[PDB]
Design a protein around this motif. Structure first.
Motif, PDB file in Angstrom:
ATOM      1  N   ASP A   1     -35.483  -7.611   9.972  1.00 44.21           N
ATOM      2  CA  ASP A   1     -34.633  -8.285  10.947  1.00 44.21           C
ATOM      3  C   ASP A   1     -33.776  -9.383  10.329  1.00 44.21           C
ATOM      4  O   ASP A   1     -32.846  -9.872  10.978  1.00 44.21           O
ATOM      5  N   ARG A   2     -34.056  -9.783   9.089  1.00 43.91           N
ATOM      6  CA  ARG A   2     -33.337 -10.888   8.465  1.00 43.91           C
ATOM      7  C   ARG A   2     -33.381 -10.805   6.945  1.00 43.91           C
ATOM      8  O   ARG A   2     -32.396 -10.403   6.317  1.00 43.91           O
ATOM      9  N   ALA A   3     -34.513 -11.209   6.361  1.00 47.17           N
ATOM     10  CA  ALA A   3     -34.619 -11.604   4.963  1.00 47.17           C
ATOM     11  C   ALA A   3     -33.649 -12.752   4.699  1.00 47.17           C
ATOM     12  O   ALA A   3     -32.481 -12.548   4.349  1.00 47.17           O
TER      13      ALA A   3
ATOM     14  N   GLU B   1      -8.182 -11.546   3.839  1.00 47.05           N
ATOM     15  CA  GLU B   1      -9.058 -10.386   3.647  1.00 47.05           C
ATOM     16  C   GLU B   1      -8.249  -9.141   3.289  1.00 47.05           C
ATOM     17  O   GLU B   1      -8.694  -8.009   3.489  1.00 47.05           O
TER      18      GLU B   1
ATOM     19  N   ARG C   1     -31.208 -14.545  12.462  1.00 46.00           N
ATOM     20  CA  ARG C   1     -32.561 -14.977  12.801  1.00 46.00           C
ATOM     21  C   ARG C   1     -32.617 -16.487  12.974  1.00 46.00           C
ATOM     22  O   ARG C   1     -32.861 -16.992  14.077  1.00 46.00           O
TER      23      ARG C   1
ATOM     24  N   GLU D   1     -30.744  -7.166  12.051  1.00 40.24           N
ATOM     25  CA  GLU D   1     -30.711  -7.316  10.599  1.00 40.24           C
ATOM     26  C   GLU D   1     -29.551  -8.176  10.118  1.00 40.24           C
ATOM     27  O   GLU D   1     -28.796  -7.753   9.236  1.00 40.24           O
ATOM     28  N   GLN D   2     -29.400  -9.377  10.674  1.00 39.58           N
ATOM     29  CA  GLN D   2     -28.342 -10.271  10.227  1.00 39.58           C
ATOM     30  C   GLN D   2     -28.551 -11.693  10.740  1.00 39.58           C
ATOM     31  O   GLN D   2     -28.244 -12.659  10.034  1.00 39.58           O
TER      32      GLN D   2
ATOM     33  N   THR E   1     -32.399  -9.779  16.436  1.00 41.39           N
ATOM     34  CA  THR E   1     -31.037  -9.297  16.200  1.00 41.39           C
ATOM     35  C   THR E   1     -31.110  -8.208  15.131  1.00 41.39           C
ATOM     36  O   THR E   1     -32.087  -8.077  14.389  1.00 41.39           O
TER      37      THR E   1
ATOM     38  N   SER F   1     -16.099  -5.167   9.249  1.00 37.49           N
ATOM     39  CA  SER F   1     -15.095  -5.695  10.171  1.00 37.49           C
ATOM     40  C   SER F   1     -14.275  -6.794   9.486  1.00 37.49           C
ATOM     41  O   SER F   1     -14.039  -7.874  10.028  1.00 37.49           O
ATOM     42  N   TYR F   2     -13.863  -6.497   8.251  1.00 38.98           N
ATOM     43  CA  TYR F   2     -12.871  -7.303   7.552  1.00 38.98           C
ATOM     44  C   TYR F   2     -11.639  -7.408   8.436  1.00 38.98           C
ATOM     45  O   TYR F   2     -11.338  -8.474   8.983  1.00 38.98           O
ATOM     46  N   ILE F   3     -10.937  -6.288   8.584  1.00 39.60           N
ATOM     47  CA  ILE F   3      -9.864  -6.123   9.558  1.00 39.60           C
ATOM     48  C   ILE F   3      -9.783  -4.639   9.884  1.00 39.60           C
ATOM     49  O   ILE F   3      -8.697  -4.105  10.131  1.00 39.60           O
ATOM     50  N   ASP F   4     -10.939  -3.971   9.892  1.00 37.82           N
ATOM     51  CA  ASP F   4     -11.015  -2.513   9.890  1.00 37.82           C
ATOM     52  C   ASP F   4     -10.340  -1.964   8.638  1.00 37.82           C
ATOM     53  O   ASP F   4     -10.409  -2.581   7.570  1.00 37.82           O
ATOM     54  N   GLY F   5      -9.688  -0.819   8.757  1.00 39.66           N
ATOM     55  CA  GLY F   5      -9.070  -0.182   7.612  1.00 39.66           C
ATOM     56  C   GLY F   5      -7.827   0.582   7.996  1.00 39.66           C
ATOM     57  O   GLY F   5      -7.733   1.190   9.065  1.00 39.66           O
ATOM     58  N   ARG F   6      -6.849   0.552   7.091  1.00 44.62           N
ATOM     59  CA  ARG F   6      -5.597   1.273   7.283  1.00 44.62           C
ATOM     60  C   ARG F   6      -5.425   2.331   6.201  1.00 44.62           C
ATOM     61  O   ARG F   6      -6.106   3.362   6.217  1.00 44.62           O
ATOM     62  N   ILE F   7      -4.520   2.084   5.257  1.00 48.72           N
ATOM     63  CA  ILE F   7      -4.287   3.004   4.151  1.00 48.72           C
ATOM     64  C   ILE F   7      -4.710   2.338   2.848  1.00 48.72           C
ATOM     65  O   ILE F   7      -4.318   1.202   2.557  1.00 48.72           O
TER      66      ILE F   7
ATOM     67  N   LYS G   1      -3.087  -6.646  15.366  1.00 52.39           N
ATOM     68  CA  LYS G   1      -3.354  -7.718  16.318  1.00 52.39           C
ATOM     69  C   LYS G   1      -2.271  -8.786  16.255  1.00 52.39           C
ATOM     70  O   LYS G   1      -1.322  -8.765  17.046  1.00 52.39           O
TER      71      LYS G   1
ATOM     72  N   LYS H   1       0.801  -1.219   0.000  1.00 58.01           N
ATOM     73  CA  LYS H   1       0.000   0.000   0.000  1.00 58.01           C
ATOM     74  C   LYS H   1       0.837   1.273   0.000  1.00 58.01           C
ATOM     75  O   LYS H   1       0.935   1.930  -1.043  1.00 58.01           O
TER      76      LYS H   1
ATOM     77  N   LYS I   1     -15.184 -11.004 -10.281  1.00 56.76           N
ATOM     78  CA  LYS I   1     -14.292 -10.274  -9.390  1.00 56.76           C
ATOM     79  C   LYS I   1     -14.710  -8.812  -9.288  1.00 56.76           C
ATOM     80  O   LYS I   1     -13.881  -7.910  -9.443  1.00 56.76           O
TER      81      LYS I   1
ATOM     82  N   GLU J   1      -5.007   1.672  -1.243  1.00 61.63           N
ATOM     83  CA  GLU J   1      -4.015   1.593  -2.309  1.00 61.63           C
ATOM     84  C   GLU J   1      -4.614   1.681  -3.703  1.00 61.63           C
ATOM     85  O   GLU J   1      -4.106   2.433  -4.540  1.00 61.63           O
TER      86      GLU J   1
ATOM     87  N   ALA K   1      -5.134  -4.564   6.291  1.00 65.20           N
ATOM     88  CA  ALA K   1      -5.556  -3.258   6.775  1.00 65.20           C
ATOM     89  C   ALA K   1      -5.746  -3.288   8.286  1.00 65.20           C
ATOM     90  O   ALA K   1      -6.431  -4.165   8.816  1.00 65.20           O
ATOM     91  N   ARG K   2      -5.127  -2.320   8.969  1.00 61.29           N
ATOM     92  CA  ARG K   2      -5.191  -2.172  10.427  1.00 61.29           C
ATOM     93  C   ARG K   2      -5.066  -3.520  11.139  1.00 61.29           C
ATOM     94  O   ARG K   2      -5.864  -3.862  12.015  1.00 61.29           O
TER      95      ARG K   2
END
Lengths: 254, 236, 566
Positions: free
Chosen positions: C252-254, A207, B80, B77-78, B75, C302-308, A214, A136, C294, C310, A210-211
């Motif tokens: 609440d779902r779908a 994934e 159920r 919206e994710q 919950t 919450s992938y791994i949050d975010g940094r910088i 941990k 990056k 793709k 690219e 990024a950040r």
């Protein structure tokens, strides 16, 4: 505190930079012998071509007649998960044999016995890599190899949302600073055990990167003995002396 | 000591959602929580070594509309997982004894004395009722014909989640009206499943008396307001 | 500063040329300068009157006052006379100066101070940031006669979108007067207008006969075209979270499981608008086949949050829609656009009308290309060059304040088709997102390196052939108030990455107003709701952009297509 110090121009051979035919790299490899180069499988799959050069400490510059280790074709891996990461180890089938020089030093083969004595003693480690896992905004021109400690297994399944198995574990500092995606993908996390050097880690992106302060993701080749043995003896003796040594194999790594 | 318990309403001792506290010599500890719906809960002061005199208490929760929190029912919206999985429990009287079926270490103290007609004591046909878990609407055979071995007379493996549909289809068939009650669970005003004295109107009535032969299903939807904290273990 | 080697040019030129004889071949070797050689003739030349003595003026030798004419300032003075600092030299916004940053980078073309690019008429003037006036001179002191140049300014001082309105006023926006109903043409273009019920009627004032929650308007005259809307100063109350109670009404779902045939909506009419009603979200690639390529690779935040960030590579075939603007001579890249069907084409308004720039196009020099994956290549079997002939202005075109709704709209007359490289897109309504406030689905803003060559320079990356996407995350509000010194209207939000130490960024790629096409997760169909405006965040030091809430303006298109049959 020991920060991100660069690799020495003496005892740092394990750095088979995997680039392309143009001026664009992707990942790196691991030097152990003259017939197999351990690296990640996503280095070639879902990427581009493959061009390897051992003893190459710099990508933009060149230190003379030292970077030469071309690769013909390549295959994949059976346990390599395309979506996530698991047993992400691939072998690079070189085309020209290279002798043992200063920047090209061999290493002894690992074994299943060094799995209960290497993780409990050496609680640290080094990550050799040019810096292509997190390409990056930290693309350093110098070969960097920082030091990262080892953490308990009960703190590695929650470092990333993906559930990690036994093959990969923690190999970094605590949630403080940037200690993940260090070096090039397929980078050797060799730990100086005792009078020898055995690699025991491959840095890969889960994934992306990024950040991730941990923990890190690094494989364990001690359990990978059954794969490096099935792809070395079943291929037979070197026909044309490392052609392919030997790329003519099935996709699930035999 | 005093084996106290807060039925229905779950406290939060040391910022940890618990419903029981049993120490000695008055341990310096206080707690707090947030009330829920109206009803008549129970303070079960079940002390086996202290019951010849009497020590019982309850909770009287009314309804004073003052403030409303942002407590969402399902919950966000994710999650159920609305499934048609109701736990079937039939209070059967299958032949169960203190000694296991064909004992390994030879429990001669109970095998050749009370397990069968040996020594001419009790006999073989017993009435020991056990709470199991069936797989369909049969009330005669569970996942297998005997038991799951790993539990024996003890209850098997039961897991709860969001909309787990904890519909305990209890049908007694022995000689005494039985029921069922999970430790610290909030139910519906229609179904009981808890030793409660709350006998109001027909809309909010709750009776757990299940006579042998009659069937009753305790229907309630376990959701996100029935889960513990984050620092503790997964399944409590 | 460390060793006696660098601090040698300060004490060298003392009594050798300041008050003695010197020219070019008399006092040239007594300077010692390898890099700063050509720029030495401009730094020493500043005092137009005299350079004597030394311990008095010190203007054309180091940099303090502005004795002479004032061409540079060493001090850190960012104030002018209105509170707003001068325009930066490495960018051209909102106006365009004579020179950019490619004539002489050795004279420090950074740090927007008080300088003079051309001739001197008063002093160290600047360019006005606001579209009001054109120049704002500074108040830099001067040696000798310490006097104030110019006079400074102390600058020291119905709810529910307005339904039950009963005001008595009749004020237009621009300059389109409207009469009453007792004239002659009272009922004109009113054969398919959906009338609601809210405000009453009146003779000749601002009313809402259609029933829009955006504003009121009247039937103007002038030219047979559009009509203007009335404006009223209400309040700055934001439409954020509701403070009442504290509960919601969302789903609440779908449950995961594609069980959707065709539950799309329809707002316009095919009779007076054309197509773009049924053929939507059906690309013969990876949509009907129920496959994933793709493209949409966005899992949990919450992938791994975010940094910088690219910006990864791309692939030919993942960016079908691509509507931009070009000129017949010369052929240069302009700004982004969008497409809702096959006739009316909408785009931004800050790339077509600019009175200060003195360049107004007609109905010939406005080209449009749909479907392109490169720039040097040119085919014919996959795309076709379009042509515009109709233009329309916006009633509330008050771009002189803070860019309030700057969206244009043209018309296409070429009967083009729809294939793989040309994909239409519908538009959402109101009966599907009545309580979807806790969301924020982003779109697919494609494009190459065009925005970097429109407002700034950005030396380093030219025109890459990679379909770089533009991310527009959702943020709160006080994030750009405690650290941001310039105010912002509550109608527009902030978009930018919070800097850690002082880095720039790389998030201003794509085009200047790319299409915001978002796939609806209810029936798997691409929708178009919202238009990306002017962006900012790669010219200062990692700040926040400005994007106004432009979600309405839906019924305005329906009330202007009545002249197609007339």
């Amino acid at each position: 505190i020991v920060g991100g110090q660069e690799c020495k121009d003496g005892e740092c051979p394990w750095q088979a930079l995997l680039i392309n035919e143009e001026n664009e790299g992707f990942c790196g490899g691991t030097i152990l012998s003259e017939f197999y180069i351990l690296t990640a499988a996503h280095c070639l799959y879902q990427a581009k071509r493959f061009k390897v050069r051992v003893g190459d400490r710099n990508t933009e510059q060149e230190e003379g007649g030292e970077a030469v280790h071309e690769v013909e074709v390549v295959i994949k891996h059976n346990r390599f998960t395309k979506e996530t990461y698991d047993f992400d180890i691939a072998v690079l089938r070189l085309k020209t044999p290279i002798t043992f020089r200063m920047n090209v030093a061999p290493a002894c083969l690992p074994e299943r016995d060094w799995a209960e004595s290497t993780l409990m003693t050496q609680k640290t480690g080094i990550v050799s890599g040019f810096g292509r896992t997190h390409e990056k905004g930290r693309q350093s021109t110098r070969l960097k190899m920082l030091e990262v400690p080892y953490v308990d297994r009960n703190s590695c399944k929650l470092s990333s949302s993906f559930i990690i198995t036994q093959n990969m574990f923690c190999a970094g500092y605590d949630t403080k600073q940037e200690d993940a995606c260090q070096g090039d993908a397929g980078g050797p996390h060799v730990t100086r055990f005792k009078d020898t050097y055995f690699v025991t880690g491959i840095v890969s992106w889960g994934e992306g990167c990024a950040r991730k302060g941990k923990y890190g993701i690094y494989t364990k080749v001690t359990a990978f003995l059954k794969w490096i043995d099935r792809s070395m003896k079943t291929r037979g003796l070197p026909k044309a002396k490392s052609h392919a040594p030997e790329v003519i194999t099935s996709s699930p790594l035999k | 000591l005093f084996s106290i318990h807060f039925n229905g309403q779950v406290l939060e001792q040391n910022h940890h959602k618990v419903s029981a506290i049993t120490l000695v010599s008055a341990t310096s500890t206080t707690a707090n929580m947030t009330v829920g719906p109206e009803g008549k809960w129970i303070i079960s002061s079940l002390t086996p070594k202290h019951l010849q005199a009497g020590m019982q208490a309850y909770i009287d929760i009314k309804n004073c509309p003052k403030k409303t929190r942002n407590l969402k029912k399902i919950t966000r919206e994710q999650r159920r997982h609305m499934k048609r999985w109701e736990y079937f429990i039939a209070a059967e009287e299958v032949i169960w004894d203190y000694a296991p079926v064909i004992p390994a270490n030879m429990d001669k103290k109970y095998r050749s004395q009370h397990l069968d007609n040996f020594s001419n004591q009790i006999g073989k046909h017993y009435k020991k009722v056990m709470y199991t878990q069936y797989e369909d609407e049969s009330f005669t055979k569970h996942t297998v014909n005997p038991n799951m071995k790993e539990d024996g007379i003890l209850g098997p493996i039961i897991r709860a989640q969001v909309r787990d549909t904890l519909k305990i289809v209890f049908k007694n068939m022995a000689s005494r009206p039985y029921s069922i009650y999970p430790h610290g669970v909030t139910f519906s005003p229609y179904e009981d499943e808890v030793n409660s004295s709350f006998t109001s109107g027909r809309n909010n009535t709750m009776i757990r008396a299940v006579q042998p032969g009659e069937t009753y299903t305790y229907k309630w939807n376990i959701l996100e307001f029935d889960e513990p904290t984050e620092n503790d273990a997964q399944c409590l | 500063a460390n060793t006696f080697l660098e601090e040698v040019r300060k004490g060298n030129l003392e009594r050798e040329c300041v008050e003695e004889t010197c020219s070019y071949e008399e006092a040239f070797e007594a300077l010692e300068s390898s890099t700063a050689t050509d720029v030495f003739w401009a730094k020493y030349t500043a005092c137009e009157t005299a350079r004597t003595p030394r311990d008095k003026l010190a203007a054309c030798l180091e940099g303090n006052c502005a004795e002479g004419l004032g061409t540079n300032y060493r001090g850190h003075v960012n104030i002018t006379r209105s509170g707003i600092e001068c325009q930066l030299w490495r960018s051209r916004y909102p106006h365009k100066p004579e020179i950019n940053s490619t004539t002489h980078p050795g004279a420090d073309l950074q740090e927007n101070f008080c300088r003079n690019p051309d001739s001197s008429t008063t002093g160290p003037w600047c360019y006005t940031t606001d579209p009001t006036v054109r120049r704002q001179e500074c108040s830099i002191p001067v040696c000798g006669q310490d006097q104030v140049t110019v006079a400074m300014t102390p600058r020291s001082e119905v709810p529910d979108r307005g339904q039950q309105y009963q005001g008595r006023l009749a004020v237009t926006t621009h300059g389109l007067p409207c009469l009453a109903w007792a004239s002659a043409q009272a009922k004109a273009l009113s054969k398919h207008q959906d009338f609601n019920s809210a405000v009453q009627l009146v003779e000749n004032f601002c009313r809402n006969p259609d029933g829009d929650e955006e504003g009121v308007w009247c039937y103007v005259a002038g030219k047979p075209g559009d009509f203007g809307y009335c404006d009223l100063n209400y309040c700055e109350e934001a439409v954020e979270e509701e403070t009442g109670d504290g509960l919601d009404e969302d789903s609440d779902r779908a449950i995961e499981g594609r069980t959707a045939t065709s539950e799309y909506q329809t707002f316009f009419n095919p009779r007076t608008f054309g197509s773009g009603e049924a053929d939507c979200g059906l690309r013969p690639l990876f949509e009907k086949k129920s496959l994933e390529d793709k493209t949409e690779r966005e899992l949990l935040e919450s992938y791994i949050d975010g940094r910088i960030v690219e910006g990864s590579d791309a692939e030919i075939g993942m960016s079908p829609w691509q509507v931009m603007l070009f000129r017949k001579s010369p052929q240069e890249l302009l700004c982004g656009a969008s497409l809702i069907s096959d006739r009316w084409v909408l785009t931004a308004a800050h790339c077509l009308l600019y009175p200060p720039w003195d360049k107004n196009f007609t109905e010939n020099d406005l080209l449009v290309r749909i479907g392109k994956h490169s720039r040097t290549r040119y085919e014919r079997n996959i795309e076709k060059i379009s042509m515009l002939e109709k233009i329309y202005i916006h009633p509330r075109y008050n771009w002189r304040e803070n860019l309030d709704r700057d969206i244009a709209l043209m018309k296409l007359k070429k009967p083009v088709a729809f294939s793989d490289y040309i994909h239409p897109v519908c538009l959402p309504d109101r009966e599907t997102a009545a309580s979807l406030l806790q969301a924020g689905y982003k779109g697919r803003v494609t494009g190459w390196g065009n925005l970097k060559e429109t407002w700034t320079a950005n030396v380093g990356k030219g025109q890459p052939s990679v379909l770089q996407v533009v991310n527009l995350p959702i943020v709160e509000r006080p994030v750009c108030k405690d650290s941001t010194r310039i105010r912002i209207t509550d109608n527009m939000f902030c978009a930018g990455y919070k800097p850690d130490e002082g880095k720039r960024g790389d998030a201003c790629e794509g085009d200047a107003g790319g299409p915001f096409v978002m796939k609806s997760p209810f029936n798997n169909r691409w929708y178009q709701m919202g238009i990306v405006s002017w962006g900012e965040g790669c010219d200062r030091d990692g700040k926040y952009g400005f994007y106004t809430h432009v979600f309405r303006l839906k019924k305005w298109i329906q009330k202007v297509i009545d002249q197609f049959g007339e």
